[PDB]
Amino acid sequence: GTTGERPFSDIITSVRYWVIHSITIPALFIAGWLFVSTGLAYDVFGTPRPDSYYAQEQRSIPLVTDRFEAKQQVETFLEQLK
Amino acid sequence: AELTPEVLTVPLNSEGKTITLTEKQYLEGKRLFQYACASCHVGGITKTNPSLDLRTETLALATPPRDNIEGLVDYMKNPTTYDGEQEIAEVHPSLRSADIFPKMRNLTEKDLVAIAGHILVEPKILGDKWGGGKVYY
Amino acid sequence: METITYVFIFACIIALFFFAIFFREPPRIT
Amino acid sequence: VSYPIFTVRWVAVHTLAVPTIFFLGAIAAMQFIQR
Amino acid sequence: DQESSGFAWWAGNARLINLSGKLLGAHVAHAGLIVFWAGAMTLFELAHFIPEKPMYEQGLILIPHIATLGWGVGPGGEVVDTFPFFVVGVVHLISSAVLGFGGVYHAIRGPETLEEYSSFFGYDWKDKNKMTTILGFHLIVLGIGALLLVAKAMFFGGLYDTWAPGGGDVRVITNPTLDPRVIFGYLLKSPFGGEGWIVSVNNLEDVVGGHIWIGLICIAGGIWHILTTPFGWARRAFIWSGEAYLSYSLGALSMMGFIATCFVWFNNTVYPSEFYGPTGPEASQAQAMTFLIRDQKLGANVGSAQGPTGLGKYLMRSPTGEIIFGGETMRFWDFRGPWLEPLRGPNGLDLNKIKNDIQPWQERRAAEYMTHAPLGSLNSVGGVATEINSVNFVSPRSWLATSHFVLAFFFLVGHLWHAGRARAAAAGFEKGIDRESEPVLSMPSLD
Amino acid sequence: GWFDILDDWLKRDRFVFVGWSGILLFPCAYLALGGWLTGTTFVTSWYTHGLASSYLEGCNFLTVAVSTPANSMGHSLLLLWGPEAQGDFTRWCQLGGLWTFIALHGAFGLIGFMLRQFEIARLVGVRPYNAIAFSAPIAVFVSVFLIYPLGQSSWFFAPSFGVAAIFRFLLFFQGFHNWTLNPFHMMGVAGVLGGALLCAIHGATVENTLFQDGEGASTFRAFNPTQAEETYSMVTANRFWSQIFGIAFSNKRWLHFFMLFVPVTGLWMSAIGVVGLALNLRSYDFISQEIRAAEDPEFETFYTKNLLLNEGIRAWMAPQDQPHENFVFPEEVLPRGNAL
Amino acid sequence: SANLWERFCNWVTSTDNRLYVGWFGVIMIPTLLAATICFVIAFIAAPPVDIDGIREPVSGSLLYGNNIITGAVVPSSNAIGLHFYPIWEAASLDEWLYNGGPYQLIIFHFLLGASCYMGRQWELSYRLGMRPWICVAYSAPLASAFAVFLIYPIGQGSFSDGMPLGISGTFNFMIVFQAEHNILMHPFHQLGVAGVFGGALFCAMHGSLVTSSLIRETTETESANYGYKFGQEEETYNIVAAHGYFGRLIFQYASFNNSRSLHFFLAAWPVVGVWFTALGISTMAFNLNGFNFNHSVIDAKGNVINTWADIINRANLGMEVMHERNAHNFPLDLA
């Protein structure tokens, strides 16, 4: 039925398209690759680096045990991590 | 930065010396352990004789003492019962029996050191896990 | 007393099967 | 025809396209994180 | 070809139902992918194969086949010489170029119809005879192939023999089982527990004799067909259509596909277990062997030992009375294997033997098998589902039996699909009910 | 007055329709699928539970998830700017904020999408038996991801948005609620399972009853997307089945309504059931059986058998599955069969 | 006459017999009546059956302490295994019952008839000049009934294993299967779920949409159903108004408009998907189990970090351990 606006088949085939994207796509790919590569991701999402789960001993898991004072608790958890 | 060279220091002889195996040996020890051990000693137990395990305390009460490199090493060369009464090289893989346990043929004095050094470091990392199973998985 | 109650509802499904097949309203062409 | 270059659909097709590749790149980067 | 003229793109290859020339190239080119594989993979195996480490512990499935024929093995399947492997692998890899050349050629350059290009090679589906002819040839070709095996056994090196009197080792069969009785017996032997079916066959004399007894039947047929045409019933029985011919041959494969999945999962003879892993029942047996030994060799009196239920840990009886191994293994009391037989007596596992005739070679062989049972995950992690990582391994016996049941099955589905289509394309209505004359519309209602 | 100018804009037949409903459906929907995809690859479930839940940690597609918040959190909404997170986004990620975020956004997202079905339907002028049908899934998600937990201790016990993180939710149920023995789940199955049968028996009946309206074999083209005569023969069908199963349809209008009722109804019963397990008002046991087995030790039914499996599932699982409970079960306590 | 056989073959093949007995049906009919009748009796009255190998008889029948939910026909004994145990192989019915004889009789018969039932589902189509393949859609369920009742046992070595004929023992088969194969973690089951879950999803869609575009031909006070007449000439709803909406819900091309292409996707999705689960049970029958990620994600020192895959396994062990409490004498469950 009613077929409106710029078509994909064409756009994908358009030389202008790849001119534009054979910069943008890999750009994003390398942009994110560095997000992990730099170790930025870790710090953004408080996710532990392979060497940061338990300090040398503490075979005990750092489990948040109470809301309200939840954060302060997590902080000290990273603290202990020396 | 967790598997420190301190966690890699295990008793060398029975008198007291210690050896600080490298992270290179460790890995290779593990590779060699799965290569000729895991089949029957996965997780540090014993599929064909659950009574005896590879827990360090266990090896200590062995005879001769196996809670050190030289001891385990002797074993892989010529195994004996937990009391040392019988030589069991004919039913347990060893150098004295490579003709029957091929995998053993590759193995060299160097390899034997790693495999052994692995049997002593694991429990240092895994703790109770290394000894029992199921219950501890 | 339960056995009986279960076997009944069952005997009913089975008689209801007969009727639903051999005693439906024939689907006449219109 | 004289189709436009920036449409509502383009806004959509990109909100999922841009993040994805960003991720596929990040995720492809992890494959080398070890020990 | 085109759709608006032939079939549909995803149905492409049916556009060739009537273009034998191309339909030959299709068949040739493909019959090249199989060889190519056989070849390319054997080298992939070999390139990884480690001379002295159990084959089953190395994901091999092709080399094991070559070994069983008696090629580069020696005593106990010792992998004495790798060359036969390299040798076999490549020959195929090359013969693939040949066949490959034919296909590409016959489906492109060559004539796309054997019609006039050669009236002997050309063929007619409904020609209820040129088919009986082509079949005939092939029926002879297979026969020559079967006889090749007998050759490799009775004349060139022999085959592997787990049952080898001295013990597993290559052995030249020189007493093929002749005689219909024994041979054909296996044919009408229940497929159920105990009396297996074809999957019994515990000795190479029969495997060999049985094959000798095949060409001298298979070729006997290859002739009878190049010399005749389907009788009356034959014609008023089957649908003579290209697609229909496929169907019958489809179900055929599928049916065998199961017969195979069963063979590699149960038989010990034509699948050494020294090259493949141990049979499933074999491993469940060896765990008892392993503990009946360990405990005996420790003070226990296995003959009298009574377990949690009152059945006796190590030994109990079977429904027919035989003394078997206890535990869940009571179900595998049918397992027969080299390492175990010497402990068997006339009423089953004998006590005296068990009590003091258990050579070390068994104690460790029994241990080897219980620690190499057919259990593992998709990502190849040997053992029970609850097991921890390390020791990645999956018995060839698993991989094989698993793959083939899938193939085997889908083919049965395939069979129906075509047998059902060709059986209606004939009456001619595989494209829809004829608006104008709906059979149903002329049948007395049931109400 | 401009309302209309807007309404006009929104209701314009674009590639991807929008609508007033879209002013909700998209802000959320995306924002939810987005959070999942994020948490799935970047954030962890270490402070909340005690496991790696993302890619960056080493998990694969099957083992990843946006795992619920700590039990000590409670039924807290976990608003990024609330008492807990205290505005700090990263910590928010660590305490499990990403869960209530996905849960709640996805929630309004399903509300949005239904309004859509209701907006597009009103426009295009068709009956709304597709927004009605979609109530079935609202029930499931609204009772399994929202009601259930609200009935228990915290959010920690809701499914977790993960492939395995769900298989776990399955076993837990079998083990603590003995779900499979609940008449409501049973109906649930009878409906999903038979809704599949309808969706496959009907599909096959249509395709193998087609009149010929083409010349080739690929009869897909023979169907004129344009009106006219039925494409298959309802009369022939009704005949087939009636002689090969005794009963058979004969009212396309009823057939297609049944197809809506069956799978929809079953997911509803499925829901009511869980609303019950929120209060642990489960269908765990049959007392008549217990009393008998207590007195007579030789009475065994597949019923009792399964009850022991549960004892096992709870004993061995509980510990690592409910960390905030600091369970410690000495090897001598662990219920076990023989040998194993 | 004209030789009754000639005639017989015409009745057997009658295209207008209330219920189409066919050539396949000549077997389906007695086979299913033997099974169905033995099942119904077995389920009502029938002594406890020594399912596992031991001598710890389980009672499944009603007259022996069960209700419809707990009752079942118990699998032939483990002492029997894969051996063929018909009634004539028993020394007495009692032996036959105590050892589970009823099961084998019931499944071998149901599998035989259910197969011919598949064949019959072709014969009639042929006799009615309709296209075949319906019988191929039904090969999914059958394949699943085959897996669970015949393939799984041939692999494990005994009919004692292999889903028991009863509501609760079906749950048993599952809860245990999991612990033994970690099925939930096997591609083939996930495809099974996408199929069964998907199938339903689409059954609601198709049924939904169509109902949503029926052409007004009835008052407000009378069923919408009357608007259709059996065998009526043309279509009964606007397949274009249908697509007109669904297309706009997601987006035009992300929709159907070809009844034939739409209806095929309906019969292919669940069938292809359900086939797989049958191939999963049939596959895990030879011990190629689900994925295993236990003790992956290990940290820097070597500490195991546990992923959801482990909480899973933790609950699986609990199953592995307690199941068949008195049937094990050695460490490994290799049967």
Ligand code: CLA
């Ligand atoms: C024994 C060999 C065999 C042969 C020679 C044929 C031959 C034929 N088939 Mg049959 N078929 C077979 C087995 C066989 N089939 C089986 C076992 C099944 C059951 C699945 C089918 C199901 C089947 C159907 C449903 C149809 C045919 C059709 C046809 C005809 C056209 C071919 C075609 O459409 O190609 C085109 C092929 C493709 C579109 C590509 C193959 C696609 C499959 C699904 C991929 C499988 C690949 C691989 C295993 C998986 C990848 C890995 C995965 C993990 C991602 C042709 C006469 C068609 C016909 O017109 O019937 C008369 C038709 O519609 N066949």
Ligand code: CLA
């Ligand atoms: C591998 C198995 C296989 C084989 C042997 C064939 C064979 C054939 N196909 Mg089928 N096909 C297959 C799979 C296969 N197909 C699948 C999976 C599909 C679904 C996508 C189809 C779909 C399909 C359609 C839709 C059509 C065919 C047609 C044909 C026939 C004509 C070939 C042609 O037109 O080439 C066209 C030529 C080319 C563009 C060249 C392709 C490159 C060559 C052949 C490969 C070279 C191979 C290798 C790299 C080099 C080796 C060289 C060395 C020996 C020196 C031919 C008999 C046609 C037909 O029926 O004709 C009437 C047709 O219309 N096929």
Ligand code: CLA
């Ligand atoms: C390569 C395989 C092969 C193939 C495809 C054929 C094919 C054919 N043969 Mg040939 N045949 C072969 C090998 C082969 N034969 C061999 C090796 C010999 C020995 C020399 C013969 C001897 C032979 C003779 C003597 C005759 C034929 C005839 C025929 C034709 C029709 C007969 C028929 O199929 O009845 C199908 C069978 C039945 C209707 C009987 C069904 C009842 C039996 C007892 C039960 C079978 C059950 C089975 C054991 C269980 C598994 C079933 C499964 C579904 C679960 C047919 C073209 C006939 C013909 O027309 O002559 C040219 C004929 O008279 N053949």
Ligand SMILES: C=Cc1c(C)c2cc3nc(c4c5[nH]c(cc6nc(cc1[nH]2)C(C)=C6CC)c(C)c5C(=O)[C@@H]4C(=O)OC)[C@@H](CCC(=O)OC/C=C(\C)CCC[C@H](C)CCC[C@H](C)CCCC(C)C)[C@@H]3C
């Ligand atoms: C098995 C799972 C299952 C899934 C995944 C599913 C999915 C879907 N069903 C839809 C529709 C339907 N489903 C229907 C009946 C059913 N659907 C069923 C089962 C499912 N239905 C069942 C059993 C039935 C009964 C038969 C009907 C009747 C319809 C429709 O009309 C509609 C459709 O258009 O059909 C195709 C689509 C609605 C899109 C949407 O709401 O966007 C808005 C919401 C978005 C984008 C946010 C996601 C919201 C949720 C709460 C968050 C989940 C969080 C993460 C994103 C993902 C979780 C990750 C996993 C690993 C656990 C969607 C593709």
Ligand SMILES: CCCCCCCCCCCCCCCC(=O)O[C@H](COC(=O)CCCCCCCCCCCC)CO[C@@H]1O[C@@H](CO)[C@H](O)[C@H](O)[C@@H]1O
């Ligand atoms: C002990 C365990 C119990 C097991 C229970 C099993 C239940 C499964 C039955 C299937 C449910 C019917 C769903 C379709 C509804 C329908 O459409 O069938 C209706 C008859 O319904 C009924 O009352 C059906 C009664 C159940 C018949 C059982 C079949 C037995 C199999 C025999 C095997 C032969 C070898 C009537 O048809 C309708 O009649 C009209 C409705 O206004 C319209 O014509 C419709 O289009 C349609 O034709």
Ligand SMILES: CC1=C(/C=C/C(C)=C/C=C/C(C)=C/C=C/C=C(C)/C=C/C=C(C)/C=C/C2=C(C)CCCC2(C)C)C(C)(C)CCC1
């Ligand atoms: C028709 C057709 C088709 C098909 C095709 C085919 C089927 C093909 C095939 C092909 C083939 C089948 C090929 C083959 C080839 C081969 C080769 C080319 C080989 C080579 C070899 C070599 C060279 C060897 C040697 C060696 C050694 C000894 C050692 C070292 C290494 C090496 C390897 C080097 C298609 C689908 C596309 C499309 C349509 C059409």
Ligand SMILES: CC1=C(/C=C/C(C)=C/C=C/C(C)=C/C=C/C=C(C)/C=C/C=C(C)/C=C/C2=C(C)CCCC2(C)C)C(C)(C)CCC1
């Ligand atoms: C959270 C959050 C947020 C946001 C965010 C977002 C919105 C995001 C997004 C994101 C995204 C949006 C992402 C994506 C990603 C993706 C990916 C990563 C993908 C992948 C894929 C793949 C890998 C595929 C594959 C495949 C399949 C599945 C099948 C078929 C075949 C193939 C192979 C192709 C905010 C700030 C508000 C706040 C806070 C929170």
Ligand SMILES: CCCCCCCCCCCCO[C@@H]1O[C@H](CO)[C@@H](O[C@H]2O[C@H](CO)[C@@H](O)[C@H](O)[C@H]2O)[C@H](O)[C@H]1O
């Ligand atoms: C097409 C229909 C097919 C039906 C097939 C079965 C036909 C036979 C139906 C028999 C119906 C009655 O079946 C009979 O019910 C009574 C209860 O009322 C049961 O009796 C049960 O309750 C009484 C107390 O009230 C107890 O003392 C007894 O121990 C207990 O078993 C019988 O054990 C059962 O055999």
Ligand SMILES: [Fe+2]
């Ligand atoms: Fe429909």
